[PDB]
Paper text:
The full-length, wild-type SHP2 (FL-WT) contains three domains: a protein tyrosine phosphatase domain (PTP) and two preceding Src homology 2 domains (N-SH2 and C-SH2). In diseases caused by SHP2, mutations are often observed at the N-SH2/PTP interface (e.g., E76D/E76K), resulting in constitutively active protein and abnormal cellular proliferation. The recently developed inhibitor, SHP099, allosterically closes the protein and deactivates SHP2 by stabilizing the N-SH2/PTP interaction.
To further substantiate the conformational selection binding mechanism, we investigated SHP099 binding to two additional SHP2 mutants that were originally designed as catalytically dead mutants, with the active site C459 changed to either Ser30 or Glu31. Strikingly, SHP099 affinities to all FL-SHP2 forms correlate well to the corresponding equilibria between open and closed states: FL-WT, -E76D, and -C495E are predominantly in the closed conformation with tight affinities for SHP099; FL-E76K and -C459S with predominantly open conformations have much weaker affinities.
Residue numbers in the entry: 4 to 237, 244 to 295, 301 to 316, 325 to 358, 366 to 527
């Protein structure tokens, strides 16, 4: 995600595009004037056009234009649909040349000010073979040091099989080098070069750069201290941790061809917010196999969920086909177009081949529970109860002021799910199925870890979000939702400690 400049003004962006760019050069940056917003700056006809992009709780909104799940999917869309981006007057804005950012402060491997001893401590405790970081030098101001661990062990050791090597990086006229050879435009360029071609020591050791040092995993028992640091005002804040996570989104541009098919286009609440092909729910009840929904598996590729959009008039029947096929017994939803897909209390309705009875509704302060009976018409023996949890106290703007409501809600949802043997994935849906949906699911994943293992366990919020985002685009949308996840997990741990 080199075209994203985290710490530049609009004036700086214009000057950068006018001096180092040409017509078609572009970059993105966070809005300094409206928290959360972003600006896409594009050079056209020797001038710079600015395009406002709102990151709401539900999606990214190119103002006056279309919705997207992430900034990276937005840029990818227009980099491959040249001529689809136009002003209201109709004039085209072409995205041709990403203007690369040199700033490394948002990269997972960049630690800024850090002593050589501390770096060795961190790499010793948390590192394994190929763990690395880049730190400012204290012995050569302005220079940097790449510290990398190599060996066969993992963690603290005394067999000498593992070591930390410190590679000095000179900064000479805004260019970076390791003392010879190529001079790189940025630390990121240097780092990417040695990821592909690791440096070999004179005696043969290959300094493989396999993964950045993890700095975000914490012990759940120490959640308060991390939160207090992230909450400070004057930097290792929620903003910085979230920005670093966002910087990884170009690794999540998985294919979404099925959702792009013409016969499926009108089954999407937003035409550009689509399910990844490799995790989408495939309907095989035959027809049409498509629904805009993804399976979300915890510990993906190392309880499950279906993350999906609110139903459309023309997808209500598909929604119930999915619920039936997947043996889902619990639905989590919010409401704020997406259509009502259940009958009123005591009524029975058919949705295509599926029949649904609303047996009983129960009102709580934070949510309404609907006990639904689902069956396939002509086959009364297929009946099963689907418990629909309609969360009611999520504010129209931002996140709940106290996570207690969500937590008690998810606790009840968890117990309902756990009481039904062999129940399928919990279905979570609202709006586009990524914002609140991802927030609910990530909270539930993290809480479930603490359920099994207790307060003395490791949790990693951004790594968990990245893992969920590899299964559906843009899960967890905003820094407010990110902070809310931490607040919810903190509240949950404190509840258990007391």
């Amino acid at each position: 995600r080199r075209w994203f400049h985290p710490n530049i003004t609009g004036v700086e962006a214009e000057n950068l595009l006018l001096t180092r760019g040409v017509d078609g050069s572009f970059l993105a940056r966070p809005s300094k004037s409206n928290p959360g917003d972003f600006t896409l700056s594009v050079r056209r006809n020797g001038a710079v056009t600015h395009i406002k992009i709102q990151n709401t709780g539900d999606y990214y909104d190119l103002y006056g234009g279309e919705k997207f799940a992430t900034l990276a999917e937005l840029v990818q869309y227009y980099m491959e649909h040249h001529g689809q981006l136009k002003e209201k007057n109709g004039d085209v804005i072409e995205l041709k040349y990403p203007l690369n950012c040199a700033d490394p402060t948002s990269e997972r491997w960049f630690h800024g000010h850090l002593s050589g001893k501390e770096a060795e401590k961190l790499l010793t405790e948390k590192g394994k073979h190929g763990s690395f970081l880049v730190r400012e030098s204290q012995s050569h101001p302005g220079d940097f040091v790449l510290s990398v661990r190599t060996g066969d062990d993992k963690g603290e050791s005394n067999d000498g099989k593992s070591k930390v090597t410190h590679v000095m990086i000179r900064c000479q006229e805004l260019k970076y080098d390791v003392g010879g050879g190529e001079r790189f435009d940025s630390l990121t360029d240097l780092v990417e070069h040695y990821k592909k071609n690791p440096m070999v020591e004179t005696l043969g050791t290959v300094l493989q750069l396999k993964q950045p040092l993890n700095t975000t995993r914490i012990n759940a028992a120490e959640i308060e201290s991390r939160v207090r640091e992230l909450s400070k005002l004057a930097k290792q804040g929620f903003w910085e941790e979230f920005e670093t996570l966002q910087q990884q989104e170009c690794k999540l541009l998985y294919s979404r061809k099925e959702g792009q098919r013409q016969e499926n286009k009108n089954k999407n609440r937003y035409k550009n917010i689509l399910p990844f092909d490799h995790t989408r729910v495939v309907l095989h009840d035959g027809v049409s196999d498509y629904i805009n929904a993804n399976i979300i598996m915890p510990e993906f590729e190392t309880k499950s969920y279906i993350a999906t959009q609110g139903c459309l008039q023309n997808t209500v029947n598909d929604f119930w086909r999915m619920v039936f096929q997947e043996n889902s017994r619990v639905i989590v939803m919010t409401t704020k177009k997406c259509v009502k897909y259940w009958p009123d209390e005591y009524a029975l309705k058919e949705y295509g081949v599926m029949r649904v009875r609303n047996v009983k509704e129960s009102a709580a302060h934070d949510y309404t529970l609907r006990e639904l009976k689902l069956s396939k018409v002509g086959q009364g023996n297929t009946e099963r109860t689907v418990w629909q949890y309609h969360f009611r106290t999520w504010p129209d703007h931002g996140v709940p002021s106290d996570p207690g409501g969500v937590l008690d809600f998810l606790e009840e949802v968890h117990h309902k799910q756990e009481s039904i043997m062999d129940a399928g994935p919990v279905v979570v849906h609202e709006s586009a199925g990524i914002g609140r949906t991802g927030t609910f699911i990530v909270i539930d994943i993290l809480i479930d870890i603490i359920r099994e293992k207790g307060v003395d366990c490791d949790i990693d919020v951004p790594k968990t979000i990245q893992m969920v985002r590899s299964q559906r685009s843009g899960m967890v949308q905003t820094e407010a939702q990110y902070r809310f996840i931490y607040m919810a997990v903190q509240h949950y741990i404190e509840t258990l400690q007391r």
